[PDB]
Design a protein around this ligand. Structure first.
Ligand code: ZN
Length: 117
């Protein structure tokens, strides 16, 4: 769903204040960097490197939010929050979930910008 995976209001504002090119430009940079980010999370997880997990989750949180991918930003926030009581149990699922869905979320943003312009 659009309203659920994307930050629609922020996106519509950017279309007006900046235009779609810088969005599609960011998207393209996001898409090429994600593979290495997920890998790093995956590796920090298996090595039981908490600080490492939290560092990469923050990085992805920042990157996703800049392009309006609200849902991925929300996952990165959880991954970077070890004060959450269920962090220990759930961090593995959040990372896997991110792994399986990031490309899909990117395809939804792309369709939206294409329709929105
Ligand atoms: Zn998800």
């Amino acid at each position: 769903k659009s309203e659920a995976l994307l930050d629609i209001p922020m996106l519509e504002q950017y279309l007006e204040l900046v235009g779609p090119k810088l969005i599609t430009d960011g998207l393209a940079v996001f898409e090429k960097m994600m593979p290495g980010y997920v890998s790093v999370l995956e590796s920090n997880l298996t090595a039981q490197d908490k600080k490492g997990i939290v560092e990469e989750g923050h990085k992805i949180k920042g990157a996703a939010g800049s392009v309006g991918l609200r849902h991925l930003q929300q996952l990165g926030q959880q991954i970077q929050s070890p004060d959450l009581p269920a962090w220990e149990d759930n961090v593995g699922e959040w990372i896997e979930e991110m792994k399986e869905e990031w490309r899909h979320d990117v395809e939804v943003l792309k369709a939206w910008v294409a329709k929105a312009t």
